[PDB]
Write a protein that binds this ligand. Structure first.
Ligand SMILES: [Zn+2]
Length: 46
């Protein structure tokens, strides 16, 4: 950790997985879902 900080963001809700910011608790909760599912290939032919 050598670099500092320049543009972080000012949001009450933040993702503890990637670092996305939101304004409403619903936006974050609805986002954290996108993370769900840890598989290289789903039921779709892909
Ligand atoms: Zn995220």
């Amino acid at each position: 950790g050598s670099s500092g900080s320049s543009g972080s963001g000012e949001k009450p809700f933040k993702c503890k997985e990637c670092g996305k910011a939101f304004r409403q608790n619903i936006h974050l909760a609805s986002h954290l879902r996108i993370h769900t599912g840890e598989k290289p290939s789903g039921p779709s032919s892909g």
